[PDB]
Design a protein around this ligand. Structure first.
Ligand SMILES: [Ca+2]
Ligand SMILES: [Ca+2]
Ligand SMILES: [Ca+2]
Ligand SMILES: [Ca+2]
Ligand SMILES: [Cs+]
Length: 360
């Protein structure tokens, strides 16, 4: 069925990229199919199964965006308000001029990609933010940023008067049934935690760091991520306010060349050429500032787009695609950090093989 389309493509991908193991969820009206392939740990040979936890890296940012949006729906967070309204410890800094929306769209004045080495804890982070000078025009330039989405997580937690992880668990993960999603893998689930494999074929596992939870720290299953995808596709039964929060994450906020930046989610109008998708995952988009043009008609979520997000760690590579117009979504998790171009190709081939897209 689905599996006759999916299986050969996955086999071929895993051989070409030497990926030890994958977990794949396909979400459609009719239901969700979960598929597991290969080994959770190349060394031990333990097979990937329903309980296997993968590092999803920057896919975590989709949850951060979702909680931020829920705080907004509840009236606790104003997305266009200055960040310093909610983190008064930043009053007088550039965060008087940068909003939560800027942070969720990577338009926060050139805020850099990585947490600097000199930042080692919350106190040193906040002092770094206080001193930092914007290098790009706020709201007019996109620079993909862990610091930015991390600060949105801090802003959101403050607006909700809660700690980020337990608040995420209670307000987003639990209501979505995401019970195999972890920021810190419990000791009792360590046997289920896949071992990563880096580009050099060496075992690797992510280390804690500043803003890890907010930016890149989730370990989860494909099935759990599929619940988030299901809700984004209007295929879940969830709380009205949570559904509203989720839908708002797909509002288009900035045009960035061919790409539309929503709240973390990135999207393209259909039909889309794979080369366009590849360009979205390349050096020029990810590692340079790109001019960004605000959409203040904030675009209502669209039904004729390819919505996506990549995420990686040193040892893992994930990709989510949604096609809201076809009520179809795809989650691909691997315990190898394999090239984004191959993620794009595999996803396109799967979705086209399933009839959810046309090629030429
Ligand atoms: Ca406002
Ligand atoms: Ca560093
Ligand atoms: Ca942390
Ligand atoms: Ca090819
Ligand atoms: Cs959990």
């Amino acid at each position: 069925q689905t599996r006759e389309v999916l299986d050969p493509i996955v086999a071929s991908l895993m051989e070409a990229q030497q990926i030890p193991g994958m977990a794949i969820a396909l979400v459609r009206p009719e239901g969700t199919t979960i598929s597991h392939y290969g080994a959770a740990d190349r060394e031990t040979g333990t097979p990937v199964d329903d309980d296997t936890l993968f590092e999803i890296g920057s896919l975590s940012k989709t949850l951060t965006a979702t909680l931020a949006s829920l705080a907004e729906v509840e009236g606790k967070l104003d997305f266009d308000a200055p960040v310093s309204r909610y983190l008064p410890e930043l009053e007088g800094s550039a965060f008087d001029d940068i909003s939560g929306l800027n942070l969720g769209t990577h338009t926060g004045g050139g805020l850099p990609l990585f947490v600097p080495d000199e930042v080692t804890d919350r106190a040193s982070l906040m002092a770094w933010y206080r001193e930092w000078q914007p290098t790009e025009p706020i709201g007019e330039s996109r620079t993909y940023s862990n610091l930015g989405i991390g600060l949105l997580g801090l802003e959101t937690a403050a607006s909700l008067d809660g700690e980020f992880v337990p608040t995420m668990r209670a307000k987003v993960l639990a209501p979505l049934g995401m019970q195999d999603t972890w920021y810190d893998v419990p000791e009792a689930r360590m046997a289920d935690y896949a071992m990563g494999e880096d580009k050099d074929g060496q075992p690797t596992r992510v280390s804690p760091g500043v803003l890890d939870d907010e930016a890149y720290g989730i370990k989860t299953t494909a099935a759990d991520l599929a619940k988030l995808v299901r809700a984004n596709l209007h295929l879940a039964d969830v709380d009205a306010e949570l559904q509203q929060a989720i839908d708002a994450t797909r509002q288009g906020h900035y045009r960035v060349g061919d790409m539309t930046q929503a709240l973390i989610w990135e999207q393209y109008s259909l039909p889309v050429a794979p080369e366009t998708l590849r360009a979205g995952q390349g050096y020029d988009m990810i590692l340079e500032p790109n001019a960004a043009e605000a959409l203040e008609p904030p675009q209502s979520p669209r039904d004729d787009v390819w919505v996506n997000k990549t995420g990686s760690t040193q040892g893992f590579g994930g990709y989510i695609v949604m096609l809201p117009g076809k009520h179809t979504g795809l989650v691909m998790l691997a315990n190898k950090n394999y090239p984004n171009d191959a993620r794009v190709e595999a996803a396109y081939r799967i979705l086209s093989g399933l009839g959810a897209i046309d090629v030429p």
